[PDB]
Symmetry: D2
Amino acid sequence: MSVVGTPKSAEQIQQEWDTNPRWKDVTRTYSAEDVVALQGSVVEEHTLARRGAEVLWEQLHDLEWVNALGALTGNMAVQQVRAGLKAIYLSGWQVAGDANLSGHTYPDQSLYPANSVPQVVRRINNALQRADQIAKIEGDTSVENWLAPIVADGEAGFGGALNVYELQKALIAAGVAGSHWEDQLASEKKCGHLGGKVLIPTQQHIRTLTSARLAADVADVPTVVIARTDAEAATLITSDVDERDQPFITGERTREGFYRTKNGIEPCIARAKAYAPFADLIWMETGTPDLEAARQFSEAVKAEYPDQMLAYNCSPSFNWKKHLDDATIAKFQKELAAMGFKFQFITLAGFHALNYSMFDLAYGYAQNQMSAYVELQEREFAAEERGYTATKHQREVGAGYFDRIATTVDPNSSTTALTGSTEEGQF
Amino acid sequence: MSVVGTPKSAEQIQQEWDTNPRWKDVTRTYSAEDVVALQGSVVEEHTLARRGAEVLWEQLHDLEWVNALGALTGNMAVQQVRAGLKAIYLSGWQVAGDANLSGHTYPDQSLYPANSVPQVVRRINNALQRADQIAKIEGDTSVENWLAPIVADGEAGFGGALNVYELQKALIAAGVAGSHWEDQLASEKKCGHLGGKVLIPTQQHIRTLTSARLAADVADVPTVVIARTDAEAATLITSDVDERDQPFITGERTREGFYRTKNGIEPCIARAKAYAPFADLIWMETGTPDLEAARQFSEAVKAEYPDQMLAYNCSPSFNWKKHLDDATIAKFQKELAAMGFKFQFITLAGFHALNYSMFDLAYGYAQNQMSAYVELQEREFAAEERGYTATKHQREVGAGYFDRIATTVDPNSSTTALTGSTEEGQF
Amino acid sequence: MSVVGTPKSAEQIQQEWDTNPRWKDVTRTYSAEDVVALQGSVVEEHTLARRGAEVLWEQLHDLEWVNALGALTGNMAVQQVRAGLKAIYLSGWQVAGDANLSGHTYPDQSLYPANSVPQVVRRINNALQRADQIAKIEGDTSVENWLAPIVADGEAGFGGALNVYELQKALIAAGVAGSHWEDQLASEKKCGHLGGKVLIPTQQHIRTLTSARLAADVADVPTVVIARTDAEAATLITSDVDERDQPFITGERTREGFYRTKNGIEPCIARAKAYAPFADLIWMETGTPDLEAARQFSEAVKAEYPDQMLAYNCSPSFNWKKHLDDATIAKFQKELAAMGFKFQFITLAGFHALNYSMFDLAYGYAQNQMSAYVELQEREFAAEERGYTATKHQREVGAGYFDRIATTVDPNSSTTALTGSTEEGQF
Amino acid sequence: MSVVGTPKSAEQIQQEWDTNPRWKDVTRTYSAEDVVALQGSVVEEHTLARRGAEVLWEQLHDLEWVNALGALTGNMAVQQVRAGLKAIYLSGWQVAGDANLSGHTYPDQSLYPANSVPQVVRRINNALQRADQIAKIEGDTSVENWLAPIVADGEAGFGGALNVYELQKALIAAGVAGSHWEDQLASEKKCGHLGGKVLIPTQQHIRTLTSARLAADVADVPTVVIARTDAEAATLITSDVDERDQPFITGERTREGFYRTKNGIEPCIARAKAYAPFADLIWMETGTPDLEAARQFSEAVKAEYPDQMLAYNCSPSFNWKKHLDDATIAKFQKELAAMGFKFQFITLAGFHALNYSMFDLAYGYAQNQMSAYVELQEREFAAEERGYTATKHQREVGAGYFDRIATTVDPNSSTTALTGSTEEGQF
Ligand SMILES: O=C(O)[C@H]1O[C@H]1C(=O)O
Ligand SMILES: O=C(O)[C@H]1O[C@H]1C(=O)O
Ligand SMILES: O=C(O)[C@H]1O[C@H]1C(=O)O
Ligand SMILES: O=C(O)[C@H]1O[C@H]1C(=O)O
Ligand SMILES: [Mg+2]
Ligand SMILES: [Mg+2]
Ligand SMILES: [Mg+2]
Ligand SMILES: [Mg+2]
Ligand SMILES: [Mg+2]
Ligand SMILES: [Mg+2]
Ligand SMILES: [Mg+2]
Ligand SMILES: [Mg+2]
C-alpha cells in the first residue's frame, strides 16, 4: 500500500533502547518484539507528544529546575507561557472540580470520566498552537517556545493495568509530554491531602508503571513517566501479598478487608527505591512543606540511585505562612532544586486564581457596578508593560489570524473582522 | 400506559396565553393546536428551565434592574452568586475563545459547534446545584437562591429557522432561563464590536424570534426571549426584499451580492419596534458607552411600546476611562435602569478576570516562585471576611457532600475524605 | 424564591416507603431524612425515568414476561418497538465494542468512559421520542407506547460506592427505567462468558445495590434495580472477609493476592438470597442455556423469597443449536417465564444484526455491485407488509416533522423538504 | 528548541506544487508563502490523513473504479473492508439520522453540530486500526489494507469560508482521505433528493473549494477534494450576481429574496466546468439512475477537461426496479466506470442494512422468541465460508489483543479473558 507510518523493526527499537542516553537506567521487563507485535501495520505519528517529551527531558537536564502551575483552560496555559513559564501542569483535582466531561463538580476521588484529562491536554495544546499562530503573523518573537511541555495527571489509572494503558495512550494522542501515576487503589482514590487513602501493593504499582511505559513504546514516543507514592499519610493497603510491604503491615484489618499499615517517610523511601527503575521522576506526597523532610527523602533515595530526579508538589492544600516564614518561602523551590527536585508545581493554582478573581470582581460589581470592572481593566492596561496582551481580546483569540485565512481565500472579501472594530478604534 | 408527562390540551394552552399576565403584548403567529401537534405523546418537564425563567421574569419587575457578568466555567458562576449576583450571563464570545466543544480557540464568528452553549448552560446549573447541596448540609443560609437564572447567547441561530429551534430546545433542556438572538447572517456572524457585519431582513429575524418562542412553547416553559439588533454599525444586508429595510438601502451591491445599507440609531429604532411584539427584551449593540445615545433609543422605542424592557451590553470592548469620567462610570448602570434597561451585563468579564489573574500569578511565580503564590493565598484568606469560601477548596468542590453520601451508604466506611485531611488540620 | 421543584418532606417520603406496594419487601438501610439531606433546595423532575420505571414495573406484573434485544443505536431501538417489543436492553458489551465515548473498539472489560452508557440511554430516548412525534402528526396509532422502558448496564460501577452513585444518577438523568449491577471487581471486570473473573465480597455488592437505590431515591424516581451475580463461573474473589463467602474459599492464593473460590450454582443461590432484599430482580450468569439449571436456581431462591422476580440472559455467547434441539429453543423463553424469569434479553443482538447484515451486503456488493443492494431494497419493500416503514427513509428520520415545524413558523415558506422530493415522487 | 514538526519552506512547497503530478491541473489562487504564514512554528503530522489520501489517489488511477458503501459505525466499516471493499463512504445523511453529537434523530438539513462527521471519521479509523491489530497477532493475511481511505461529507460547510476551513481541518485531524462540498446555501441545506434546495453563486462555491484546499495545504496533506453540484433539481439561487449563473435566472424573486432559476443538466455542466480547476472529482446529483444522462454529463465535462475524474451517488432515494431492469442494474457501475465515474457509492447503505436487519430480527423475536435469533446465528456460522469472523464476537472486538497487552505487562496474570471463555469452549 504505502510506506506512510511503517513501523520500525524490533531490531531498530532494541538498538535505540541499548544506545540512546534517554534510556539509561530504564528497566523494561518486556521485549522489543513484544512492542512490535502490538503496533499493527501502521504507527500514527504523535508530533506534539514527541516534541513535548523531548523538550521536557532536555529542560530537566539543562535548567536549574522546571516549575509549573496547574492549568484547567486553554487560555490559562497561554498566560502561563506568556509570563515566562516553560511547562504546564495538568491537575486531575482541577479537572474534577471544574473541567471534566461529566459536567459535574467533583471532589478529587477519580469520579469523572477517564478521558477527561486527555481532552484537556488536547485543549491546552490547541490554545498554545493558536497563540503560536498569532505570534507568527504578528512578528512577535518574545516567546521562544509556545508549545511548552504538558505534564498530566494519570491518577491511579481508573482501573487495572489495561485502563492505565488506555489512559496513557489517550494522553499521548492529545500531545502530553509526561504523565504521573500513583500507588492508590483507583476505586478509593483521594487527593494526597485528603484522608481515607488506600495503597496497593508495591508490585501492583510497578505493573502500572510498566503499562504506562508500554503504551508510550507502542505509540513510539519517549514520554516522561512519573511515579508518585502516597505512603506518607495512607494507613490502609489492599493486601499483604508483597514482601516489601509486609514490614509496615500491623495485622489489623477493616470490615472492607483492607490491611492497616504504618505510614511515614520510611515506606515512602522503600517504595521510591522499588519504583526507581520504572520511573523518570519520583514524587512523594507530604503533609507539610518541609525542606528537612524533603532532604531526608532525597538523600535516602540517591544513596542508592544518585542520578534519580525527583518531583515536588508545592500544594495550596498547605497553609504556607502557618508553617514557614517569608524568607524560607522565598528560597523554597531553589533549595528543593539543589536536592534534586527537578520538576516542581503548584497543583491548584488555576482553581484559586479563577475562583478568587471572579469572587473579587463579582463582589465589587454587586456593590458598585461598572466602577469595579473598570478597576480590573485598568490593571490590565498597566500589565501591558510586563508583556500582557489579552487587553486586546479580539486579536488574543485569533481575530487577526482568521482575517488572514479569509483574505487568503478571497482577497476582496467584504466581511473581515478587525477593520472597523472597536478594538482597532479604541485600543 | 401512563399519565406521567401527558400534554396539555390546546384549550388549556390557549387559556393560559389569553389570561396569564406573562403573555400580555406577546404575539404568537401560530396557534395552540400547532403547539400540541408538535409535542408527541409525552412532554418532558424541564425543571430548571421553568424555575429559572419564572425567577428571571419576576426579578425583572421586582428589582431596580438585574445585572450579570459573563461566566465560562461552573466555578465562575458559583462565585458570582456567592458574591451576591442574581443572574448569570453566558457569553458566546467567551465560549468561542475558551470553552467550546471543538477544543479550539476561536474569534467570535459562530465557528464552534452549535451545541457548545447548551453544554455550558448545563455545566453552570450543575455547579450551582452542587453549591446548593453543600450549603444545605453545612446549614449555610447566606445565599437565598443558588440557582440564579442563566441568560444565554443564541448568536444568529447557526443557520435557518430550524437551527434556531433546535438551539433553543437544547438551551431549555440544559436549564436556561432566557436566550438572545441577533439579526446577523449566521454564516458571517461577528461580535457586535467587530467589523464586517451583515444584517438579514427584518422579517427574517421575526421568523427567528418566532421559532425561539415556538421551541419554548413546545417545551412547555416560559423562556425569556431577547432580541438583539446589530444595525448601529452594520453596513451590509443580505437582501432588499423587506419594505421596512428599504429606506436605508443605497442601491449599491457588493461582489458577494450583499446590499450596502445606512447604519446608525435609526435602523436600530425601526427594527426594535418591529421586534417588540416578538421579544420580552430588546437590545441594541452600540459602539461606545453613551448614556445620551441609550436614552435616545429608549425614548424612541417606548414612545410606541411604553412597557417594553430593554437590555444593555456594558462591553469590555469599550475603553471605559477613555470615554467617561469616574462619576459617570459610577452611576452608569443606575442611569440606564431608570431608562428601562432592566437587564445589564458585562459580556467578557470572565475572559478578562481569568486571563489577567493567571498572567499576574504566573509572572510573579516566574520571578519569585512560592512568594507570588502566598500573596494570592493570603488575599484569599482576607476575602473570607467578605464571604469568600474557596480557600477551603476540598469542601468547596463537595468533599463533605460526597462524605455524606458515603456514610449514608455505609456509616462504618474506612475511606472517607475530610477526616485526616490537611484542610481539616490547617484551615 | 419559587416553588418549582420543591423537595418532599421526609414525612412524605417515609409514608410512600411504608405504604406504596412498589416498596413491599424493599430494604433501605438509610433513612428518609438521609435522602432529604442530600437533595438540596430544588429537585429536578426526570419525566422519562419516572414514566419508564413505572411502565416497566407494571409490565413485569401484567405480562407473562418482558423480553428485549440489545440496542446500540437510536434507530435500532426504534425498529425494536415498531416490531412490537415492549422494552429495550442497553448492553455495556455492545457499548464497549461499537458505541462508547472514547471512539475505540474495546472488549467487555470496563475500559470505556463511565458516562458512555448514560449517553446511549439519552440517544435511545431521543430516537423513540422522534418516532413518537412522527407517528402523532401522521395519525399512526399502530404502536401504543413508543417510549418503551430502557434497562441499562451499570457493569461493576466503575469503582467504589460513589462511582456507582454517579452512574445511577446519570442513567436516571438520561431517562433509564432500570439498571443492573454485578458483583465483580471493577478493575478486572469481564463479560460473564469470558474468563478471568474476580468477585467482590457479598457485603460489598450489597453496598453497591444500596448506593444504586440511594441515587434513585435522591433523584425521586422508582428505578428498577437488578442484581447480577457472576459466581457460577468465577473462581477468584478479592477477599475472604465476609463470612457468607468463606464456605467457598479454598485457601489458595494468586500472586496478585486474590483468593481462589469454588464456583457453581451453590454460591449463586447464596448470593442471590443475600441480594434479594436489595434488588427488584436477580440475575445469575450461566455457562450454557439450560432449563434444568435455571429451574434449580429459581426454586432455591423462591424457597426463601417466593415473590422474587428473576432475569435471564439469552446470550449470543452460547452456541444455541450445539446445546438444544429446535423444540427446546422454541419454548425456551416461555418455560423460563413460568419459573419466574420475568425479564429476558438477548444482550448482543444489535452487534450481530449490524455486523452480519453489513458483511452480507458488502460481500455481495463487492461481487455484483448494484444487484446486491437492490436485493436488500426489495426485501425492505416486502417488509412493509409486517409494518416496516424505513424504506421511506426521509420521513423515518423526521423530514415531515421538521416540515411541520417550518410551516408553523412560516406557513408560506419556499424551502420545505418533502414537497418535490424523490421520496414523494417514487415511493 | 526542537526540530520535530519543523515546517517546510515556501520554496519546498512551491516546488512540489510545480512538479508533483498529484497537482497537475490544480489551481491554487493563493501562494506558497500564504500557506507558510498560516502554519505557526510546528506542523502536526497527520499520518492517517496522509496515508489515506495517498492510497485513494493511487486507487483512483489503478482500479477500474473505486466503490464504497455508507458507514455510520466503526464495526460497519470493518465489515465493509473484511468483505473486500477498498474505500469507506461517510454519509452526512446517516450521521444526521443516527450518529451525530446532538444525540437527536434529524433529517438531512445540516441540523447537527459541525464536528459530528469528524468524530465519526476518527471512530471508523479507530475501528479499522483495531481490526488491523487483531489481524497481526492472529497471523491473518486475508486483508491487504485494513486502513481503507475514508471519503467524508462536508455538506455545505456549515456557514462561510471559515466554517468550511475548520471542518476540513477537523476531518484531516481525524484521518480523512477525501471530502466533498456542495453548492447549496448552508442555512437551507437539503439532501440532494429532497425539495426546497437553494443554490449559491458559482463563485461562492469556488471560494468553498479554495478554502477546503487551503486547509489541506496548511495541514500539509494531499486530501482529495470533491465538488458536488445540486443544480439538476434546485429551482432557487441566493443571488444573480455571478454572470455564469445569469443565463438560468428568470427574474422572479420569492418572498424571502431568493431568485428562481432553470434547473437541469445544463447548469450542472456549466458549474462542473467552473469547478474543475478546483476539484479532484466532480459529482452531479440526479433525480433518477440514468446511464444516458450520466453519459451526457461526463462527455460534456471531459470534452473540455479530458482527464477530469467524476463521482456518482448510487442513491437509495431511487426506487431502483421501477426505473431499470435487472440486466441494466447489473451493469450500472461498470458502465459508469467506463465513462469516467471513478468513485461510486451507495450513500444510505448503512442506514438501510441497520434498520432492516433489526426490524427483521425483532419482528421474528416478538413472535417466536429464541427461534428467530438462532436463525441469525446459523446464518452467521454459514457466512464463515465467505470470510465472516464476527460470530466469534470476543476476539472480533479485541479480547485477544488486550490479553496480549496484559501478558506483556504481566505474563503470570490470573485475570486474562479468552482462556475459560464460552467462546473458546463452544465456538
Ligand atoms: O495539592 C493538592 O492537595 C491537590 O492536588 C491534589 C493532590 O495533592 O493530590
Ligand atoms: O462585548 C463584546 O464586544 C463581546 O460580547 C461580544 C459582543 O458584543 O457581541
Ligand atoms: O451475553 C454476553 O456474553 C455479553 O453480554 C455480556 C455478558 O454476558 O456479560
Ligand atoms: O442519497 C440520498 O438521497 C441522500 O444521501 C443524500 C443526498 O443525496 O444528498
Ligand atoms: Mg491528582
Ligand atoms: Mg529511574
Ligand atoms: Mg455573542
Ligand atoms: Mg415585547
Ligand atoms: Mg455488561
Ligand atoms: Mg427483592
Ligand atoms: Mg450529505
Ligand atoms: Mg480538476
